[PDB]
Amino acid sequence: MVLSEGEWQLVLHVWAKVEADVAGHGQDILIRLFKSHPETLEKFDRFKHLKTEAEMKASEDLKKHGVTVLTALGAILKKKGHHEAELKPLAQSHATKHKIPIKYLEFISEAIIHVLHSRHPGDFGADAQGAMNKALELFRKDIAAKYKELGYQG
């Protein structure tokens, strides 16, 4: 898995758009995730109370967590596939007591692609989508590598 420099620039260009409204993109992404995969809600102590889309839209926890997730992801994306010791740790929040399975990272990757296309169709066409798919694949591989190194089940 490798992105060209041109593909990394597509990823970073749309990420700048994300960064202009991180809370809105984070909300849209988690709502899409939980509507697509309502079974994933059970793994999250801070989200178990949220059943309906209305409840999700009004949740400060969900908005906060969206920002945390995108910020953690963004820091990885901006490394452009390179690995730095300082980013070795696995992000961890009080939202869940569990190590989240890798498959859920596949689920959220689908949601990210959907939401970016929804909000930014002009600048998120097939080329940018392919690039983001590759970047998110590398992201998931990185996380799986961390779980292996630390002894966590993914």
UniProtKB/Swiss-Prot annotation:
Highest taxon listed in the record's lineage: Eukaryota
InterPro entries: Globin, Globin-like_sf, Myoglobin
One Gene Ontology cellular component annotation held by this UniProt entry: extracellular exosome
Top EC class of this enzyme: oxidoreductase
Entry keyword Transport: yes
EC number annotated for this UniProt entry: 1.7.-.-, 1.11.1.-
Keyword Transit peptide: no
Location in the cell: Cytoplasm, Sarcoplasm
Modified residues (Phosphoserine): S4
The reaction(s) this protein catalyses: Fe(III)-heme b-[protein] + nitric oxide + H2O = Fe(II)-heme b-[protein] + nitrite + 2 H(+); H2O2 + AH2 = A + 2 H2O
Binding site residues for heme b: H94
Domain Globin residue range list: 2-148
Modified residues annotated as Phosphothreonine in this record: T68
PANTHER family: MYOGLOBIN
Role played: Monomeric heme protein which primary function is to store oxygen and facilitate its diffusion within muscle tissues. Reversibly binds oxygen through a pentacoordinated heme iron and enables its timely and efficient release as needed during periods of heightened demand. Depending on the oxidative conditions of tissues and cells, and in addition to its ability to bind oxygen, it also has a nitrite reductase activity whereby it regulates the production of bioactive nitric oxide.
Subunit field text: Monomeric.
Family according to the record: Belongs to the globin family.
Protein's UniProt name: Myoglobin
